[PDB]
Design a protein around this ligand. Structure first.
Ligand SMILES: [Mg+2]
Ligand SMILES: [Mg+2]
Ligand SMILES: [Mg+2]
Ligand SMILES: [Mg+2]
Ligand SMILES: [Mg+2]
Ligand SMILES: [Mg+2]
Ligand SMILES: [Mg+2]
Ligand SMILES: [Mg+2]
Ligand SMILES: [Mg+2]
Ligand SMILES: [Mg+2]
Lengths: 121, 234, 67, 101
RNA sequence: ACUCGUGCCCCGUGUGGCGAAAGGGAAGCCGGUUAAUAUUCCGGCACCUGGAUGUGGGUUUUGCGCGGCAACGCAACUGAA
RNA sequence: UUUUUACUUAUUCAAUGAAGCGGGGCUGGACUUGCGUCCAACUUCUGGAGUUAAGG
């Protein structure tokens, strides 16, 4: 009348589990995507060393949001200035803001990009 | 087709120390969960201890044939359902809308009586003709006095198997006690037959066994040990 | 009603039947957890007397405390 | 007065026994069906020094009667036991040095 | 295993987290460059991990390489529990 | 009434992955004459291997 048990240990039987099907959302409006491009990119850096590498290395220096990562910075640059980069280096300055060195692709000139879109000369 | 020459036997010698044991049924010694363990040990303890007669009288229940006869009678008098009550109320509503008084369209109902307090009051007033007490009332207290009350009031009773059985008879989950007071004339003879059969086939047999204490039955190994001791002595 | 009989029986805590029931239930409760939900009151008359009702929203919890 | 050193020793703290270099306690096999009814054969793999213990310990490997695995035990080595020695544990084990009866 | 998530079939003795910038541990070197950083920037030349699918090569077609007495070798040269 | 020793289910201890506990009956035997009882279950030459069953 009883089932055969080949193991001397008892395991909790697996039972059906159901996904949540709430009859009301807990929050009504999903939040808009925080940290979009307009928040990611703040302003270009126009110091001596920032402008030096625009010519010497074909890279643009920006001040970006402190919680933005390299992928977000790359996507924001592409969306906001149609800029394609080969790599982006980042640091956090002693003042607490993030500085990003974005090296452009060799076919695009950082001087023209800065002159026409960034207002830098 | 004859068997090919290269099929042969590889019997396994499961003796001590020469082969891995086969996967046999180990259901006798599984580490059961605590609720199962307590469930079985509870029954074991009630068998081991001496049960006072008032509780021990409940292990003598109605036989299968007598229970079948009793339920055959009772299934004609199980109470009305929700739909039946709604239909009766609707037709009474048409009656008193027509102006004919209530209880003219409907007739006197004959139904089995349930509910512990209601049944106790019925047998106290001697209106109950036959009482069936469930044998497995979780707090036996609720029914431990019922056989004595029925004996005092001179009403035939039977301890029947199935609290859930009485419940499904009466359209509930459990009933724990059932009483029949009056039946229709077409089966008053059936009621008399059932009462006489219940009396002479349960009460007369349990007249003496209901007075003795519940057994202090020991376990299987203890019983075997005592048998061996007695056999060796003799 | 049977609750009057239950009330009268509960006074006879020294009788054989009540003593047996108390001993067995004490063993069971000792085997159970120190605090645990009880499906129904084990003393229906006492619970109803103290205000328990058999409807949704009423809960019985059994607890043992060191003596 | 103060709490004396003998009283302080029972608190634990700095008087707890050192255990890092101790690999396993020296225990027999759990008493099983094979040891109760017949015997079981084990192989001595190594004789090791247990820090804090004067006696050496013997690592002995047995087969599991019920599974394909193999089980290594840690016995107190009896003098005369050696690596690669067969020892036998059970009711029917022979009466030789290192056998558990 | 299905057009579609939800149908089953096996194994089980275990069944948490934190805790090392000197313990364990995948992988980067040289040259040059700034006022201030660099094994991080620039140039050249590399490596590791993970994921994908190609070209060639190898092996086989009732099947999963060959050689050396051997220690072993060769660019691979199926492999669940 | 007091003491002693019996039971196991209260209670307490120990082991384990809670695997072989207790009764038997099939066989193997060895001991005995109103054919009757007791024992046992297959691993000891070797630092190998033993698992996902062969068969009826
Ligand atoms: Mg960095
Ligand atoms: Mg409820
Ligand atoms: Mg002091
Ligand atoms: Mg950590
Ligand atoms: Mg380190
Ligand atoms: Mg590099
Ligand atoms: Mg470089
Ligand atoms: Mg790769
Ligand atoms: Mg090819
Ligand atoms: Mg023979």
């Amino acid at each position: 009348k009883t089932k055969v048990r080949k193991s001397t240990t008892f395991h909790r039987p697996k039972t059906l589990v159901l996904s949540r099907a709430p009859k009301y959302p807990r929050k009504s409006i999903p939040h808009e995507p925080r940290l979009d491009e307009h928040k990611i990119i703040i302003h270009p850096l126009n110091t001596e060393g920032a402008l030096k590498k625009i010519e010497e290395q074909n890279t643009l220096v920006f001040i970006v949001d402190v919680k933005a990562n390299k992928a977000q910075i790359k996507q924001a640059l592409k969306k906001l200035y149609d800029i394609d980069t080969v790599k982006i280096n980042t640091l956090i300055r002693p003042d607490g803001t993030k500085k990003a060195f974005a090296r452009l692709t060799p076919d695009v000139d950082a001087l023209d990009i800065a002159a026409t879109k960034l207002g830098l000369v | 087709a004859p068997k090919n020459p290269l099929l042969e036997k590889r019997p396994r010698n499961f003796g001590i120390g020469q082969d891995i044991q086969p996967k046999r049924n180990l259901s006798r010694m599984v580490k059961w969960p605590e609720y199962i363990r307590l469930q079985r040990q509870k029954k074991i303890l009630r068998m081991r201890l001496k049960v006072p007669p008032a509780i021990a009288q409940f292990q003598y229940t109605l036989d299968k044939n007598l229970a079948a006869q009793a339920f055959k009678l009772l299934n004609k008098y199980r109470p009305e359902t929700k739909q039946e009550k709604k239909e009766r109320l609707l037709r009474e509503a048409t009656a008193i809308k027509e102006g004919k008084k209530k209880e003219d369209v409907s007739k006197k109902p004959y139904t089995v009586k349930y509910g512990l307090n209601h049944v106790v009051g019925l047998i106290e007033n001697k209106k109950a003709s036959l009482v069936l007490i469930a044998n497995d009332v979780d707090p036996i207290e609720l029914v431990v006095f019922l056989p004595a009350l029925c004996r005092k009031m001179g009403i035939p009773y039977a301890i029947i198997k199935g609290k859930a059985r009485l419940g499904t008879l009466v359209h509930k989950k459990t009933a724990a006690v059932v009483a029949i007071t009056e039946v229709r004339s077409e089966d008053k003879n059936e009621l008399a037959k059932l009462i006489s059969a219940v009396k002479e086939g349960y009460l007369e047999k349990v007249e003496d066994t209901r007075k003795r204490w519940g057994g202090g039955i020991m376990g299987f190994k203890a019983q075997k040990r005592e048998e061996k001791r007695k056999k060796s002595l003799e | 009603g049977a609750l009057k009989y239950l009330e009268e029986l509960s006074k006879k805590k020294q009788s054989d039947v009540v003593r047996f029931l108390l001993r067995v239930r004490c063993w069971e409760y000792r085997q159970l957890n120190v605090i645990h939900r009880a499906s129904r009151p084990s003393r229906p008359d006492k619970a109803r007397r103290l205000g328990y009702k058999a409807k949704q929203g009423y809960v019985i919890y059994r607890v043992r405390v060191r003596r | 007065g103060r709490v004396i050193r003998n009283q302080r020793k029972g608190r634990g703290s700095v008087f707890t026994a050192h255990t890092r270099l101790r690999k396993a306690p020296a225990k027999f096999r759990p008493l099983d069906y094979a040891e109760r009814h017949g015997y079981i054969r084990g192989i001595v793999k190594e004789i090791i020094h247990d820090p804090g213990r004067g006696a050496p310990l013997a690592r002995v490997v047995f087969r599991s009667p019920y599974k394909y695995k193999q089980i290594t035990e840690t016995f107190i080595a009896n003098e005369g036991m050696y690596t690669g020695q067969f020892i036998y544990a059970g009711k029917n084990a022979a009466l030789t040095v290192g056998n558990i009866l």
